[PDB]
Design a protein around this ligand. Structure first.
Ligand SMILES: Nc1ncnc2c1ncn2[C@@H]1O[C@H](COP(=O)(O)OP(=O)(O)OP(=O)(O)O)[C@@H](O)[C@H]1O
Ligand SMILES: Nc1ncnc2c1ncn2[C@@H]1O[C@H](COP(=O)(O)OP(=O)(O)OP(=O)(O)O)[C@@H](O)[C@H]1O
Ligand SMILES: Nc1ncnc2c1ncn2[C@@H]1O[C@H](COP(=O)(O)OP(=O)(O)O)[C@@H](O)[C@H]1O
Ligand SMILES: [Mg+2]
Ligand SMILES: [Mg+2]
Ligand SMILES: [Mg+2]
Lengths: 53, 491, 442, 477, 466
């Protein structure tokens, strides 16, 4: 039972790290998307403010 | 270029009617009339168009006046005549408004007849300064366990109800209004709280449903409802909170205690942003004008508790704010959070988890705090608050189970505002340990049964706790008495 | 003097056209024909004899063509010992209903910062009593302090504790500038100062002068009220030799009022939404707060951080203008620990072994390290330390006492006492005593 | 005379629109009536947009504006050493006037491609983390980037102080003249910094250009170029200079304000379009001249203050893409007792190893490889890596205002990397280090002497080092 | 025609002409300026006024300066003697080596070759480099992205591409220095002088250099890539060569265009880039083509801002890329040169319809075996390196022999290392990797497949190990 537990733990932690890196990749995509949108929104604010003069 | 350099003005100025108390519309569009003339008009003065429409002189410009129209511009053409009336906005105030539904200018819209008040008051009046006030001491009872225990509100405070859409903000305000029926029905005059509900930018059907809910709870005979609905011109939705605030300042200045609800201020900010962008004022963050903090600030600073030399009245404000996707880092939420005296933060995840009212105690706060609580609620709430904080930071098995017990204890159904004695009874029963033996899913059933029991059996104990305000040692023993007996007899 | 006419009134911005005698920028103009005094501060010259101005109170009822007189000088407030114990608004009128402020001297609120050769190097630590502040990032006399924080972390209660302890334990004519803060809190602070003897309404022995420009005022007033407080403290330093305290609460209201003036002042906005002129205008303000060879002005500044960001242009610009910043965090405030000082975000320039000494410096660094790394014994010591950073009846824990107590926890001398015997107590003695009682009962 | 003399038409927030001046050049310095000065930044058809080196309260519509005929220039020369000047070269230390005999423009062009040669000789920082893992050469633009209160100024001041050992000695081509430009700093912190430098006798070879937070935005804009001109003077005359900009973030903020008020079209975060240009044409004047042009050099250490460690903000992006590396400082490493709080995983020096000294090359190659593998991992083999990494990272900490000579650094890192401190567990190394240093300073002056004279650890000195270190380790607590 | 300066705002200059307005994209020359200041017309504002962007510093410009029109957009000296020589956007010698005594001058801002001039068959550009010609082949008239850094040797790869393309084919090279650090430009100049690609004393230089440094206005940094493109288009269209055009950073080209459009007052777009980002990239990249006269193959170093491959600048550049080589530092730490990552390097002409099924299948097999070797590597990380599979360790050694055979001695590195530069034809690379995939060279040791040319040199070395 000691054996047949370290193995199960090793494979389970492999699965955990793989799934965590998948989520990291997807959240990084969303982070880049959001930061581009933020830059766009602040630029449009500045431009619309400059155009009212 | 130049608004007044139109060829008409120029031609019959070179070739050769009162232009001091009268003007002519140069251009009307989207509810913004530029007016040539009116050389004597004051800033924020209310003018009168030929078609019976009114306007407010918001932009005093070197050669024209930007007037915002109080209605539909289809009745205003270029060249129309604009007269002065010489006055800033004013609304009728007094006791004759209770039970009436008016619009942003004090005109009745419930068809019960014209208002019969005798006093009018300006809407742009200033707030009481440093000297006339005094510290917030008296409790404003909301009948909601989570609020009156953990986020207590006092008379003269400005507590913000902030949250996403469909989380229970209007329900909190309406429970608060309904709860004052036990005080306004008695005869003790200095516990009566007259309510004012300001509906800004809502459906007319929503306000009709709200008025029916208040009438079916008999809570209209002491309530005013100012209603600037979604179809009304942006100036009226902009002006409604100030009209309501003046209607409540009447009660404040005359030794009475008023409560006012701005439902909500996000739509008031939207109306002001529209009027300002159409007046060509330079947009700021999220296109909001630069002086919208000034807007909400000079509105909310008029909620004060006066000292005994100034009558001793009060005005309590409960502004409502709707966040988009729980983002309080926005502009208007930032401003109104920095202005008020604490916020009752309602969450959407907590709402569907069965926690209703969905009050986030971790994020809520009340800068007045226990100073706005009765002694009994204070005695139970100090330990309740620390219990819940300990639970949340490690949300050790005792902490977790006690915190879950308290969380089930704080739930409460809609339109059922509890008197403070029963709230103290429940919180006592829950904090001193008598619910550690119950598995959380029965805490609600307990609360219900226990309170049926203590209202049927122990009217004298609740009466003395209401009389004194605290849990006397004899009354403490009687509370332990009753909760021990009931926990024995419970199933 | 010079007489002009109002030509345009847009919100809180008034344009005035002078036939002759154009007033320089920053001058104050008075509007004629009004009950209460309405001062307009010049901001821009627009040519054709026209200036743009920011109003100091609401602009309702102004008429295009209303005469405007020129003061010929910036906003002049009365300065002197007769301002002690009084409350004045941004323009120096009393708002305490006690009569005029009969002083011998008037001072303009727009003055140049001290020179370079007037600069001082002396840094003498002022111990406040609090364990977290005086231990991790203690204050220095003569230096600007700063207390950053969001809405609800405990900034004003912190400045109240500081007022109590410091301003009562001081003989140097403190000044409190309320920059756009709640009228309720201002009234409570006034009435709590009166009854605590710091303000004496009879036989004036008062030692604090209050200046209040509050939230319901226009942006110009909330932008200049900090300069009014500056001018009072600058009198008490320049022409009195005293070592002044200056409690500015809150300074972010000063910055955001700057934002709101820039909005319509006809200027392109910078990042977020603040003015193009944020850094240098806040700098011209914050450089008048310094220790010259004539006197000192140590400044305790409560600073509002919008949405707990700390990267917002106003806080990020203020950070460099202070000598010992202690940031009040929200995450620690929800732990119930109070004060909410962030140990890993509160920096002191006098926390170096040449000034505080060997033992204090080593304790500060070790506590910060054990908090950052937070070995189960290490986590237990770290939680004990997190608890012992709390301070409630109020407490007064002297500096050597607290370095001794945090050493005794750090070395592990009291690893048997439970974690929450250190919560809301004073020195190590009250901690071991609360452990005593809680142990023998439970 | 409306060709060499204009008249102010408008004024506000620092920007003087001037009507007239039909013969003024773009970026020429004009003189107002009240004594103030300005720069003709905008030349428009109807007016001239001038930026005032002062305040708006004193100038007023209708004032007279004369023109000088020359582009903005500063005094340069030896006479500035020891003096604290402002962004125009005027003395603000009260020690009198500057006896400078040469003036030099501020907006000159950086040297071309032919005049340069590769960065070969080392600029000694006296900091172990820098001199070992991020070496800097004479002619290099090394960025010092990090959030607030992380130790950037302290790195700069340690460098300036360390140069004293070379400036007092005999080798004229090993001396370094330092310039410290302070932009947006407090006047108090600049005064205390000048005192710090005077106590360590580090002013006789230092120039301090100061544009504090109470100075007009044009002055904070101009100060880096004035300092760079004062340093280019030494570069063009066979000497070696080192200029620190503290920091460029506030110079960019001043320029953003100036241009926004001149109505120039804003870009990201309202910065103008040429704000990249602004820094590059400044940081490109730091070069290493070949011996056909004098052989001088000018090393730049620009400072950058990020926000929440965001290094791809606009200005950090620009200055990272301009410079030849960066030295990252971290608050989290600052509070973990790692001081200087240099994050080595991120810190870069592209022209580093070519400048490093042969001895420090030998030792720091091994040190960098070992720290790299330790960072990559952080049984009975990889916790050997862990333990070596712990000893090494405990060997990098260093105190303030006490920079070490190069041979002392090589001795310490050599004791570390050969495995001698594998016996001593972590919280001991620090003590040992100091003690060990004292030892090798007192009784062993010949070893350090010819390690400094030879520049490398040849085998005799290697054996001497190993016997010394184990002799000291045996008799150590 | 002669006009007068009427406005100077930073780097934009408004000139006013009396009789003849110059069309857009035309070089005006300012009179009296001690150096050569060139404005480029970007706009016609009306009232005979013309907005221009300056190609140098604008200090000392006076309202009223005389501005002389040229007639042509910008004329740079083109010819076989720009080789081994540095010049700037304007076409003036930078290297302090005298003027460029060429015969003809070509105007920048040409048009992309017409539709009927486009050659229609995709063709591989044989570079003689094993790892590139096998797994990520370059197409004639294509665009390639160098995803390299500083550590890994990239200048060596560039110099070797120059050398090979000059030797295998007859093609000269141009190197554009858009937005480049002057220190790195001097370093590259001297490295290319040392390695023989540039000859200071003969007429055998294989590359012409064009540099726009970082201390130059946005107009320069924006037109310098076009200057290099023009001096390459001359070689292509007047000598029938297969030119190699390098662009040391294309992101700085994009950002210089962004700065230029910002100066002209245009409203920015997504993230802040110019509204004309796609068309500005296209009007340049469309001239790097394979015409019926010759070809221009472009190697463009790419910087990905914020490591976002969806950022508008790399996402608008990737629309034009045909290949991609990644110079990993990880591969270099393994000791492989060139350190081209064999798995992250891509090519669009890899399909069997273009390189034939033989090449496609050899490269596909090599790729699959390298992927399976990295798999078996992370399973060997078990520390239980055993061989319960015969095929697993068989392929482990096969793939190690392969990934060492993807190493090659470059001629340009013949002075630093005694190893001789062995460029290998395409068919020999295909054949050698075919053999190693077929399992033949098992008896050969591992280290005989390191810094070798074709397999002949490999087996010769293997014999010579004893
Ligand atoms: N304490 C409660 N218990 C159960 N249901 C509740 C409670 N409070 C509110 N609700 C219900 O949640 C829904 C939303 O309530 P409510 O409209 O009052 O919140 P809101 O913030 O005003 O949302 P909206 O964006 O529509 O204005 C309603 O159906 C309401 O009846
Ligand atoms: N090597 C060190 N060892 C110990 N303390 C240090 C060290 N370096 C800096 N400090 C301290 O850390 C603090 C940071 O101050 P410092 O000016 O050096 O960094 P900074 O980032 O420039 O701060 P600021 O944002 O105000 O400019 C200083 O009090 C300094 O004394
Ligand atoms: N001694 C205390 N006991 C309980 N709550 C306290 C105590 N001191 C401060 N607080 C709480 O601190 C919070 C922050 O108040 P305040 O100082 O107004 O915040 P800030 O100034 O940061 O906006 C309030 O909710 C207040 O009740
Ligand atoms: Mg609602
Ligand atoms: Mg506060
Ligand atoms: Mg610094």
């Amino acid at each position: 039972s000691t054996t047949s537990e370290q193995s199960a733990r090793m494979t389970a932690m492999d699965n955990a790290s793989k799934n965590a890196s998948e989520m990291i990749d997807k959240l990084t995509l969303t982070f880049n998307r959001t930061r581009q949108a933020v830059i766009t929104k602040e630029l449009i604010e500045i431009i619309s403010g400059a155009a009212a003069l | 270029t130049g608004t007044a350099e139109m060829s008409s003005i120029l031609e019959e100025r070179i070739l050769g009617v009162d232009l001091e108390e009268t003007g002519r519309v140069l251009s009307i569009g989207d509810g913004i009339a530029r007016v040539h003339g009116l050389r004597n008009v004051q800033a924020e003065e209310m003018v009168e168009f030929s078609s019976g429409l009114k306007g407010m002189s918001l932009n005093l410009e070197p050669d024209n006046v930007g007037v915002v129209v109080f209605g539909n511009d289809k009745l205003i053409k270029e060249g129309d005549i604009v007269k002065r009336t010489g006055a800033i906005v004013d609304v009728p105030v007094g006791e004759e408004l209770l039970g009436r539904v008016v619009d942003a200018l004090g005109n009745a819209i419930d068809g019960k007849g014209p208002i019969g008040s005798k006093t009018r008051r300006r809407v742009g009046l200033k707030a009481p300064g440093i000297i006339p006030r005094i510290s917030v001491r008296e409790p404003m009872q909301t009948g909601i366990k989570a609020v009156d225990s953990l986020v207590p509100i006092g008379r003269g405070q400005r507590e913000l109800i902030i949250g996403d859409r469909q989380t229970g903000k209007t329900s909190i305000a309406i429970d608060t209004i309904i709860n004052q029926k036990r005080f306004n029905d008695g005869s003790d005059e200095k516990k009566k709280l007259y309510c004012i509900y300001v509906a800004i930018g809502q459906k007319r059907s929503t306000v009709a449903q709200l008025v029916k809910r208040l009438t079916d709870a008999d809570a209209m005979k002491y309530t005013i409802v100012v209603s600037a609905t979604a179809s009304d011109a942006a100036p009226l939705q902009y002006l409604a909170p100030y009209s309501g605030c003046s209607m409540g300042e009447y009660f404040r200045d005359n030794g009475k205690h008023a409560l006012i609800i701005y439902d909500d201020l996000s739509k008031q900010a939207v109306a002001y942003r529209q009027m300002s962008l159409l007046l060509r004022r330079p947009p700021g963050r999220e296109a909001y004008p630069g002086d919208v903090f000034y807007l909400h600030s000079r509105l909310l600073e008029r909620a004060a508790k006066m000292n005994d030399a100034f009558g001793g009245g009060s005005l309590t404000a409960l502004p409502v704010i709707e966040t988009q996707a729980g983002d309080v880092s926005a502009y208007i939420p930032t401003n109104v959070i920095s202005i008020t005296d604490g916020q009752i933060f309602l969450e959407t995840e907590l709402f569907y988890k069965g926690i209703r009212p969905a009050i986030n105690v971790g994020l809520s706060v009340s800068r007045v705090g226990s100073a706005a609580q009765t002694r009994a609620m204070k005695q139970v709430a100090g330990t309740m608050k620390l219990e819940l904080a300990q639970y949340r930071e490690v949300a050790t098995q005792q902490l977790l189970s006690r915190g879950v017990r308290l969380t089930e204890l704080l739930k409460q159904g809609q339109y059922s505002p509890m008197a403070i004695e029963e709230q103290v009874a429940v919180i006592y029963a829950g904090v001193r340990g008598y619910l550690d033996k119950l598995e959380p899913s029965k805490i609600t059933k307990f609360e219900n049964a226990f309170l049926s029991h203590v209202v049927s059996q122990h009217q004298a104990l609740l009466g003395t706790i209401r009389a004194d305000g605290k849990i006397s040692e004899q009354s403490d023993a009687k509370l332990k008495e009753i909760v021990t007996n009931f926990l024995a007899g419970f199933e | 003097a010079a007489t002009g006419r109002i030509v345009a009134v847009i919100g809180a911005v008034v344009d005035v056209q002078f036939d002759e005698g154009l007033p320089p920028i920053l001058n104050a103009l008075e509007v004629q024909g009004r009950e209460t005094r309405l001062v307009l501060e010049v901001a821009q010259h627009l040519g054709e004899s026209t200036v743009r101005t920011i109003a100091m109170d609401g602009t309702e009822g102004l008429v295009r063509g209303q005469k405007v007189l020129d003061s010929g000088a910036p906003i002049k407030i009365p300065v002197g010992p007769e301002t002690l114990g009084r409350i004045m608004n941004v323009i120096g009128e009393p708002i305490d209903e006690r009569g005029p402020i009969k002083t011998k001297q008037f001072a303009p609120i727009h003055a140049e910062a001290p020179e370079f050769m007037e600069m001082s190097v002396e840094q003498e630590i002022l111990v406040t009593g609090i364990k977290v502040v005086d231990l991790l990032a203690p204050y220095a006399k003569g230096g600007k302090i700063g207390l950053f924080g969001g809405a609800g972390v405990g900034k004003t209660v912190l400045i109240m504790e500081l007022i109590n302890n410091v301003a009562k334990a001081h003989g140097g004519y403190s000044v409190f500038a309320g920059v756009g803060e709640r009228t309720r809190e201002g009234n409570d602070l006034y009435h709590e100062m009166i009854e605590s003897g710091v303000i004496n309404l009879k036989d004036a022995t008062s030692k604090v002068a209050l200046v209040y420009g509050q939230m319901n005022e226009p942006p110009g007033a909330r932008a200049r009220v900090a300069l009014t407080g500056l001018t009072v403290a600058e009198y008490f330093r320049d022409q009195e030799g005293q070592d002044v305290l200056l409690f500015i609460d809150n300074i972010f209201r000063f910055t955001q009022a700057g934002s709101e003036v820039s909005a319509l002042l006809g200027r392109i906005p910078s990042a977020v939404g603040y003015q193009p002129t944020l850094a240098t205008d806040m700098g011209t303000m914050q450089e008048r707060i310094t220790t010259t060879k004539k006197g000192s002005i140590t400044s305790v500044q409560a600073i509002y951080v919008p949405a707990d960001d700390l990267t917002d242009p106003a806080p990020a610009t203020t950070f460099a203008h202070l000598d010992a910043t202690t940031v009040l965090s929200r995450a620690i405030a929800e732990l119930g620990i109070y004060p909410a000082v962030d140990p890993l975000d509160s920096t002191s320039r006098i926390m170096d072994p040449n000034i505080v000494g060997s033992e204090h410096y080593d304790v500060a660094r070790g506590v910060q390290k054990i908090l950052q790394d937070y070995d189960k014994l290490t986590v237990s010591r770290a939680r004990k330390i997190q608890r012992f950073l709390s301070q409630p009846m109020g407490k007064l824990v002297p500096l050597k006492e607290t370095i001794k107590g945090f050493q005794q926890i750090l070395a592990g001398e009291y690893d048997h006492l439970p974690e929450q015997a250190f919560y809301m107590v004073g020195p190590i003695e009250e901690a071991v005593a609360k452990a005593d009682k809680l142990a023998e009962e439970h």
